[PDB]
Design a protein around this nucleic acid. Sequence first.
RNA 1: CACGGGUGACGGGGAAUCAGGGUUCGAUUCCGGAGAGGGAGCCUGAGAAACGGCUACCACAUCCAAGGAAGGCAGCAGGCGCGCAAAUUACCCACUCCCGACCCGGGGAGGUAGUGACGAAAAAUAACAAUACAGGACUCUUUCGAGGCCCUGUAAUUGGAAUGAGUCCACUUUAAAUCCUUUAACGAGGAUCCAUUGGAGGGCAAGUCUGGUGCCAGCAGCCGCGGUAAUUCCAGCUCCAA
Lengths: 124, 141, 55, 185
Amino acid sequence: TVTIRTRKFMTNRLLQRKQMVIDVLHPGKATVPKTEIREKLAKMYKTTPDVIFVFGFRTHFGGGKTTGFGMIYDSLDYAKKNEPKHRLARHGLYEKKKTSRKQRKERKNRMKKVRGTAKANVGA
Amino acid sequence: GKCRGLRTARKLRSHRRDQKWHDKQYKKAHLGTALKANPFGGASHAKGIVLEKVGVEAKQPNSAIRKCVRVQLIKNGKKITAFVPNDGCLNFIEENDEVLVAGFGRKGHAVGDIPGVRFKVVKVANVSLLALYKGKKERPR
Amino acid sequence: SLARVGKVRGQTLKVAKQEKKKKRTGRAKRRMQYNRRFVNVVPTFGKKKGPNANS
Amino acid sequence: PVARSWVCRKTYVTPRRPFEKSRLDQELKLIGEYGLRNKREVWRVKFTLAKIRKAARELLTLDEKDPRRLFEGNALLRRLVRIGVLDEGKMKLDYILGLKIEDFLERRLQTQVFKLGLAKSIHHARVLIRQRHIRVRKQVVNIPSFIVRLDSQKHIDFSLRSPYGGGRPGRVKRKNAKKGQGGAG
RNA sequence: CACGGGUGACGGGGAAUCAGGGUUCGAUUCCGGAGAGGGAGCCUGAGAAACGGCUACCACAUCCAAGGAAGGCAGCAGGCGCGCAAAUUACCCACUCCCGACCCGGGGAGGUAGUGACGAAAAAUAACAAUACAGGACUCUUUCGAGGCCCUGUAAUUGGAAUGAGUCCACUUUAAAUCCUUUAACGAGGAUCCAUUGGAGGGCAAGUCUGGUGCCAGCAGCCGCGGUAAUUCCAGCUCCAA
Ligand SMILES: [Mg+2]
Ligand SMILES: [Mg+2]
Ligand SMILES: [Mg+2]
Ligand SMILES: [Mg+2]
Ligand SMILES: [Mg+2]
Ligand SMILES: [Mg+2]
Ligand SMILES: [Mg+2]
Ligand SMILES: [Mg+2]
Ligand SMILES: [Mg+2]
Ligand SMILES: [Mg+2]
Ligand SMILES: [Mg+2]
Ligand SMILES: [Mg+2]
Ligand SMILES: [Mg+2]
Ligand SMILES: [Mg+2]
Ligand SMILES: [Mg+2]
Ligand SMILES: [Mg+2]
Ligand SMILES: [Mg+2]
Ligand SMILES: [Mg+2]
């Protein structure tokens, strides 16, 4: 009962992708997840769901319509070439480091104090 | 206007600029003598330390004993006969306490039965006299 | 003298507040106000009595 | 320097005299007639009426065959026709001054639901608006201040997610059915 | 109207009140100016008399083995003091851009969250049906009374019907979260899931009600009220303004 339509279709050869605004109609249930969005776009466009990246859903009032954006790359190599690392880490092919920002600033200001090769020996 | 020439702008402007100073509100607002004589110093509220409680006799026909407080300010050190507004609220005010002092709504003027009192008390030791009168809060002891 | 502070407030009789059905509020209060003003009463001769008028 | 609007405007203006008996009489009759929530609901429609009448006076003070006057007059007549207070044959900038708070309150969605008759009373219509039983062009309206356009007047009906419409029953009906089945066995 | 003085005066676009005219404010996110406790001087560099650059003096202040060394939060958070008066010692470069040898790094600029009743916009705290009653356009009846095609309101009388506020799995949101919207399951009859703030002599809407006080307490922005029957105090009820 979930229906996906596409608006504002555009082909970016300079980004090697497709792009459209996704309109999801889901009467009788909640907001459907992005995995089901990628699966239904995959069975719509006859491609693998690995290259389909969908983000940014906003649900209208009343509860029968959402608005979201999505892009469909040519390959995963092109997706890793021009796709943000945080939206790659949303799905899990990329994993960012866990070094916290204030501790990185403190380590940088500690390495600023000591001159020489011992800048590496200051950190741990 | 009296001089109705086509180029009497400086005459009309200088005459009005001279005659604005004879207005009571304009001269009080634009001279620093009233702001110096004001104990608040261009302020709406002021905290001050209680030192004694005064029973002020009333004016003509209305005859009563109003209850005032000799408040010494913090920002200037000036002394104010501040007024205790509600009934039975002098007992809440003890000696050597910080109380909040506001006006009475006539913009620095003695009001009604009370001679020589311009200001009143709002809060008593960070506890409001309105809540002390209504019975909502308690004096911190 | 300052000995008579709170005299009448001390010596009045402490009357307890009567328990009462809670009043309707907002649009329902203004609707009930309109109903008790206009649609209930009729135009009568003489001077019309006030809302809180009693005898 | 932060990136935000800081643009706001008071939609209502309080009157100059607070305790006019005739003014309170008129506003009380308006609230009791069209089912309003407070005096601010009168005052904001009065202030929008003041805006429209001030624009109308500013157009009538302009000269005839002025391009700004003709453009703003045609635009304001188009706005009055599309909100449906002024008639499509009556549209002339001299007739804007003869317009009234009652005809502005006639286009309230609460009043339009009451005139279409799907609700019993005006405040019952306001209860339906608050409880989200009605929709306008497949869009649920929760707020009774919806200025219904003349083009979108005929599309007012019950919403799909509503027990008064074609949907699931409410909490009271479900609880009564569950208690009945529990008492039966 | 020079010069001098004061400014509780950075200037402007602009803000409020506004008929038409004016009056007051503008430190405040945009443009330009000035400054980094007070002045003064200089290196580097295209661009500084730069202060998260130095060099001296004054005020303040740290360590010392008493020879000496080091400082500038009117940056972001936060602490003291001053006050009538004003927020978290948070998360992140993902949005906007800036800089660098630069697609990769950095940014307390900035973005997002925590406090927030400065303020602005929308806006819950009930509605319906049935009984008793109190009445209005008809018919009938001299009035009293009666039938309901039409009604309107009231009463801790009864009845189910509908929903949030909250609780809470799950998506969505987001750099990662939070909130909004969606969505199962709970969740309302004194729907105790209880709306207050001021007043009731006049101005100014709204009791010559009841009890106490007796020019005392107090009320009162103005006139005035209280001197033992207070429409003005203190309490209850009722009503009025939002
Ligand atoms: Mg007198
Ligand atoms: Mg100066
Ligand atoms: Mg200055
Ligand atoms: Mg300025
Ligand atoms: Mg400088
Ligand atoms: Mg400083
Ligand atoms: Mg310098
Ligand atoms: Mg600094
Ligand atoms: Mg700097
Ligand atoms: Mg404040
Ligand atoms: Mg960035
Ligand atoms: Mg980068
Ligand atoms: Mg900042
Ligand atoms: Mg409530
Ligand atoms: Mg009273
Ligand atoms: Mg009065
Ligand atoms: Mg009156
Ligand atoms: Mg009075």
